């Protein structure tokens, strides 16, 4: 059908937008630490702890096969990155302090990316 279409290109633009914004917040993580997932190899309790693991490529990975629906879904994840990393992580550590840094800095980048996601549609 032709709604099924139009639907298909507005999850598409969606897309176009949450790729930019997820370089944007990758940018203000210069030293890399939330680029790949915690590997199970180098902290084996790790799941014993975090429960839903998140990382840029993983989120990366989920958006190029369209599969994020909505601001609301992408917003999640970034939130998982943010919040196992404080979880997991001492105050005094530079993982922390790189994740409250992170989270400051996204705010302004997913303010205005809601703005637009409801202004365009």
């Known amino acids: 059908?032709?709604?099924q279409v139009a639907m298909e290109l507005r999850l598409t633009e969606l897309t176009r937008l949450l790729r930019s914004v997820l370089?944007?917040?990758q940018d203000k993580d210069p030293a890399r630490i939330f680029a790949q997932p915690v590997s199970l190899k180098e902290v084996p309790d790790y799941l014993d702890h975090i429960?839903?693991?998140m990382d840029f490529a993983t989120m990366r990975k989920r958006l190029e096969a369209q599969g994020y629906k909505n601001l609301h879904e992408f917003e999640e994840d970034f939130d998982l990155?943010?919040?196992n990393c404080m979880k997991y992580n001492a105050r005094d550590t530079v993982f922390y302090?790189?994740?409250v840094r992170?989270?400051?800095?996204?705010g302004v980048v997913l303010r205005q990316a809601r703005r637009?996601?409801?202004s365009i549609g």
């Not at 992170?102 to 996204?106: E, N, T, V």
């Open 116 to 118: 637009e996601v409801d």
């Open 102 to 106: 992170l989270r400051d800095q996204g």
């Open 97 to 99: 302090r790189a994740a």
């Open 23 to 25: 370089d944007q917040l």
């Open 51 to 53: 429960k839903h693991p």
């Open 81 to 83: 990155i943010i919040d």
């Open 1 to 3: 059908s032709m709604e």
